[PDB]
Design a protein around this ligand. Structure first.
Ligand SMILES: *[C@@H]1O[C@H](CO)[C@@H](O)[C@H](O)[C@H]1NC(C)=O
Ligand SMILES: *[C@@H]1O[C@H](CO)[C@@H](O)[C@H](O)[C@H]1NC(C)=O
Lengths: 49, 108
């Protein structure tokens, strides 16, 4: 924060290396999921059961 | 998908006899069945609308029972005024509906 620097040593900041690629991994299950059987079903059960 | 089967395809009997019929399914469907009768003509008719519950306005010569995937219908005393077509159908999805195949009856 000045226009003049005295003789010596100084410490300013830090450095970090950057990545270059993106990787994702998931299991290979490919079955359609049965949400249909419950949401639009015909008759629902009773509260006490 | 849901698929039915009926058995046997046809049978014949005489008056005053017990008759039976079987309807089978590929997976349990929890007693949501019914049967339809349709004589040669125009209008199919509702006969039994549950596992063992019958529609009003029909005499008491009919019975039937079942659960899981095993379902049987029967008539205790055949009468000559019974020559028609029969079917079993099911329902568990809001719309995925299908009838069976067909059962034939003939008199002696
Ligand atoms: C799919 O995942 C299974 C799980 O072990 C694995 O054995 C298989 O090699 C993977 N790939 C294919 C094409 O099945
Ligand atoms: C249930 O049935 C309705 C019929 O209109 C459909 O729009 C809906 O997507 C179905 N539910 C599921 C989870 O598929």
């Amino acid at each position: 924060k000045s226009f003049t620097v005295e003789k010596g040593i100084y410490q300013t900041s830090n450095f970090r290396v950057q990545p270059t690629e993106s990787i994702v991994r998931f299991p290979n299950i490919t079955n359609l999921c049965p949400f249909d059987e419950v949401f639009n079903a015909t008759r629902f059960a009773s509260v006490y059961a | 998908d849901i698929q039915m089967t009926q058995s046997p395809s046809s049978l014949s009997a005489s008056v005053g006899d017990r008759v039976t019929i079987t309807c089978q399914a590929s997976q349990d469907i929890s007693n949501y069945l019914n049967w339809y009768q349709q004589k040669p003509g125009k209008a199919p008719k509702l006969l039994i609308y549950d596992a063992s519950n019958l529609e009003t306005g029909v005499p008491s010569r009919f019975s039937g029972s079942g659960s899981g995937t095993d379902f049987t219908l029967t008539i205790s005393s055949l009468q000559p005024e019974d020559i028609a077509t029969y079917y079993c159908q099911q329902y568990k999805i809001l719309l995925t509906w299908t009838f069976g195949q067909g059962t034939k009856v003939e008199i002696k």
